[PDB]
Amino acid sequence: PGREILVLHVGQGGNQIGYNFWKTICEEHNIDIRSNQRKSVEEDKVDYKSVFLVEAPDGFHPRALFIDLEPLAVEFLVKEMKLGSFFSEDLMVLSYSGAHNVWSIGYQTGKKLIPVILEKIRDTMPETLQGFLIIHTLGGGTGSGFGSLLTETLKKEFPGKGVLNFSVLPSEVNDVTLAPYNTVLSLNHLSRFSDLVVLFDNTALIRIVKDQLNYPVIKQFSDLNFLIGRVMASITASLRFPGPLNMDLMEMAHNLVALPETKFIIPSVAPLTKEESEMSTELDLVERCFDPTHYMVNCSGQGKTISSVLMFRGNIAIENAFSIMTDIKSNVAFAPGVHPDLGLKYGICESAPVDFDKEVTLLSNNTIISEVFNRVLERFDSLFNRDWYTSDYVNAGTSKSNLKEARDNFDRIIKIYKEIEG
Numbered sequence: 122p123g124r125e126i127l128v129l130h131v132g133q134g135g136n137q138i139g140y141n142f143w144k145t146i147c148e149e150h151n152i153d154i155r156s157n158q159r160k161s162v163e164e165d166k167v168d169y170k171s172v173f174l175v176e177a178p179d180g181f182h183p184r185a186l187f188i189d190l191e192p193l194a195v196e197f198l199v200k201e202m203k204l205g206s207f208f209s210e211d212l213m214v215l216s217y218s219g220a221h222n223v224w225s226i227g228y229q230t231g232k233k234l235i236p237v238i239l240e241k242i243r244d245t246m247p248e249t250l251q252g253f254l255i256i257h258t259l260g261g262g263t264g265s266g267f268g269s270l271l272t273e274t275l276k277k278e279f280p281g282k283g284v285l286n287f288s289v290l291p292s293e294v295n296d297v298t299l300a301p302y303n304t305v306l307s308l309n310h311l312s313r314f315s316d317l318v319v320l321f322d323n324t325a326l327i328r329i330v331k332d333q334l335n336y337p338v339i340k341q342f343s344d345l346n347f348l349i350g351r352v353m354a355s356i357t358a359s360l361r362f363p364g365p366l367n368m369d370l371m372e373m374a375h376n377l378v379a380l381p382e383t384k385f386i387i388p389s390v391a392p393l394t395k396e397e398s399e400m401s402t403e404l405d406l407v408e409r410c411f412d413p414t415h416y417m418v419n420c421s422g423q424g425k426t427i428s429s430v431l432m433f434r435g436n437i438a439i440e441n442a443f444s445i446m447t448d449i450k451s452n453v454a455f456a457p458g459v460h461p462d463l464g465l466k467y468g469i470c471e472s473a474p475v476d477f478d479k480e481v482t483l484l485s486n487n488t489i490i491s492e493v494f495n496r497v498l499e500r501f502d503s504l505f506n507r508d509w510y511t512s513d514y515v516n517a518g519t520s521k522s523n524l525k526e527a528r529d530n531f532d533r534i535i536k537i538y539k540e541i542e543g
């Protein structure tokens with residue numbers, strides 16, 4: 122026993138993303154998400170299901186909590202996806218009143234549910250638990266404010282356990298006008314309390330789905346969120362299946378986090394289709410991952426890589442994985458103080474994601490964070506300098522001075538990344 126991870130999904134986006142993640146996890150372990158059973162004894166593969174799944178005598182269950190301040194997103198998702206025996210009622214922590222897209226309301230109102238959440242965690246968490254994943258969006262009020270409160274609470278209550286955030290940034294034109302306030306307040310909180318923040322945005326996700334998968338239409342968020350689920354599953358694959366070179370959550374964080382503040386990570390995966398997986402080389406896939414077309418955050422260019430983690434899954438030639446490292450270092454821009462021999466951390470897992478031949482997942486700590494975050498700051502200043510939309514933050518405990526304090530700490534992070542860039 123050990124290695125276990127508990128996943129907290131927060132707000133509408135966090136819980137919708139949770140559907141795709143748990144669908145992927147059950148498929149990889151050949152668990153039927155509707156019966157809670159193995160699909161077959163014969164195709165049960167050598168694995169370590171306990172990382173994300175609790176095996177009880179009646180079947181398997183997610184080690185998860187489904188948290189929101191209003192009930193519709195979760196209730197509708199569970200009905201539509203026929204999840205009622207897997208996303209069961211004892212794992213749901215729901216209120217009724219909503220955060221109304223204000224981080225401060227999500228934070229304040231979420232505080233009332235913290236005792237219930239901690240009791241649920243302490244009820245079912247094994248003592249060997251390696252850490253927590255928090256899945257949430259940053260632009261609304263619940264994922265952002267309650268997700269921030271949860272990051273702070275878990276770091277304080279469970280010292281020694283990793284706290285990792287999978288966090289969706291606002292789109293290139295925000296679809297919540299309050300998103301700059303909510304994103305700055307969340308990223309300030311995560312800079313204080315998270316161990317590692319893996320970022321995504323919907324502009325990049327839409328571009329990948331339209332240009333790499335060529336889907337004719339995106340009708341439901343499931344047809345975007347599967348990409349976030351793919352990153353979460355693949356970076357933990359070596360905890361769950363055999364392979365030559367395994368890595369755990371804090372092993373990856375320690376290789377990425379050069380300075381304590383540089384904990385904001387851009388993910389990418391290649392290829393996106395089974396057909397591409399069968400007609401590609403290790404070099405080709407790694408080059409795709411380092412190309413902005415495949416980054417899951419909308420970036421103007423390749424930036425400068427400070428440190429990266431690459432997970433190679435499936436039918437991988439180890440000699441090609443190693444031989445291409447000098448090519449990665451010569452063709453991808455790294456930050457100026459990165460030695461020619463450094464900046465890569467490898468994991469290699471024998472299990473390919475379902476139906477592909479092989480797949481590469483990249484987590485990159487990249488100075489281009491500074492451009493992404495400066496745009497957020499520019500949006501924040503456009504509202505704050507006019508005192509627009511501040512009233513409901515002030516009424517829920519975030520003074521105008523506190524908004525400014527969060528902004529200025531956010532700016533200090535931006536500057537640290539820009540300094541490393543040169």
Ligand SMILES: Nc1nc2c(ncn2[C@@H]2O[C@H](COP(=O)(O)OP(=O)(O)OP(=O)(O)O)[C@@H](O)[C@H]2O)c(=O)[nH]1
Binds near residue numbers: 258263290291323
């Ligand atoms: N990728 C992705 N983005 C989502 C999803 N659901 C909402 N979003 C984005 O999340 C932001 C809106 O936040 P929500 O997650 O709906 O809000 P919430 O966290 O429930 O907060 P409140 O509604 O204010 O209580 C917008 O930027 C949406 O585009 C989702 O399922 N997937």
Ligand code: NA
Binds near residue numbers: 261
């Ligand atoms: Na919501």
Ligand code: NA
Binds near residue numbers: 133261
């Ligand atoms: Na909403």
